[PDB]
Design a protein around this ligand. Structure first.
Ligand SMILES: [Ca+2]
Ligand SMILES: [Ca+2]
Ligand code: NA
Length: 342
DNA sequence: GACTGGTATTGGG
DNA sequence: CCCAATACCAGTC
């Protein structure tokens, strides 16, 4: 197999530079303004300038405006970003019908049948970079390998405005030498569990008892990591079928008052039914994020489809149940639907 | 902040 | 009860 992964460079900030040539040269910081007080929220994307002056994704807007107050700070236009994103995906379709969109700024292409080797893979990568820059004035980073995981790591190594091949020999090396924390799907918490079991590199998963690994990180991760380590991972490039669909929103003020919370819950439900489109769910869970950012949820599965009306009615009973059983103020509220009708 | 997927824990016909 | 249903834990972007 030959896989080509495309990752748009510092996407949201870059798109603002397109829509406003002026931002040329300026550090640019796109934020999620949560609306709870002035500058409440976090940084979504920071361009290269902002980064070298110590600004990065996921830090508070205020903590960022300390570290460098000089930068230009903008708000999300998810919809505008989505239009650009969607168009770029359509351009990628031109190069391969076997596409997997992983997020608003990332996609895999299976080009096993569109090229013969990595020399030609690299060349097509350049065509893609040219074509996207030409149509959308957005640079991307392209990673190329024998599977999805190593294609993604290639791009991580080559960011920004890059292109990289990890060949069969570099795969073997990385299996032994790549910090396992840098493998997609492995976060700080898993890395720390892995490290205490003596597992710092992919290859290490081959010298521990499976049951111990599975017992510590669950079966899916253990198998995932082992199949990579044996150089046998080969999941097809295919857009994944969602098992749940939902929405969760931050409230402007923390609360336990149903009549304050409902508007948010009901909007979240309505937008969830727009996303559901034609799928009818049989399960609903109401999810509350408390004022200390703990996550509580209550749910119910029905023996039949749930209409939006039923969702409204049932959501309220589930929110009441949460309010009965946890005394904290609620900060975010939302819902998750699942168990769709075949 | 806003999502979803996986799974240890749990309770009801 | 013990397995489908929970209500968490976790990673990503
Ligand atoms: Ca990305
Ligand atoms: Ca990116
Ligand atoms: Na990681």
């Amino acid at each position: 197999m030959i896989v080509l992964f495309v990752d748009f460079d510092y996407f949201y900030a870059q798109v603002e530079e397109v829509l406003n040539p002026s931002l040329k040269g300026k550090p640019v910081v796109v934020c999620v303004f949560s609306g709870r007080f002035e500058d409440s929220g976090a940084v979504a994307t920071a361009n290269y300038e902002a980064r070298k002056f110590g600004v990065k994704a996921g830090i508070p807007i205020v903590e960022a405006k300390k570290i460098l107050p000089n930068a230009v700070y903008l708000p999300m236009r998810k919809e505008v970003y989505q239009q650009v994103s969607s168009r770029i995906m359509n351009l990628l379709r031109e190069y391969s019908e076997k596409i997997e969109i992983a997020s608003i700024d990332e996609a895999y292409l299976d080009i096993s049948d569109k090229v013969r080797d990595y020399r030609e893979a690299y060349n097509l990568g350049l065509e893609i970079k040219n074509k996207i820059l030409e149509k959308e004035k957005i640079t991307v980073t392209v990673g190329i390998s024998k599977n999805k995981v190593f294609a993604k790591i290639a791009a991580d190594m080559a960011k920004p405005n890059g292109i990289k091949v990890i060949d069969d020999e570099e795969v073997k090396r990385l299996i032994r030498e790549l910090d396992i924390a840098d493998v997609p799907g492995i976060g700080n918490i898993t890395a720390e569990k892995l490290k205490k079991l003596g597992i710092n590199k992919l290859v290490d998963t081959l010298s521990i008892e499976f049951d111990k690994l599975k017992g510590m990180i669950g079966e899916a991760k253990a198998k995932y990591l082992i199949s990579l380590a044996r150089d046998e991972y080969n999941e097809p490039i295919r857009t994944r079928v969602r098992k749940s669909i939902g929405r969760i929103v931050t409230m402007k003020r923390n609360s336990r008052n149903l009549e304050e919370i409902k508007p948010y819950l009901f909007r979240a439900i309505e937008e969830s039914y727009y996303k559901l489109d034609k799928r009818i769910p049989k399960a609903i869970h109401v999810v509350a994020v408390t004022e200390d950012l703990d996550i509580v949820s209550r749910g119910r599965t029905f023996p039949h489809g749930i209409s939006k009306e039923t969702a409204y009615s049932e959501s309220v009973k589930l929110l009441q149940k949460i309010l009965e059983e946890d005394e904290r103020k609620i900060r975010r509220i939302g819902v998750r639907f699942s168990k769709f009708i075949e």
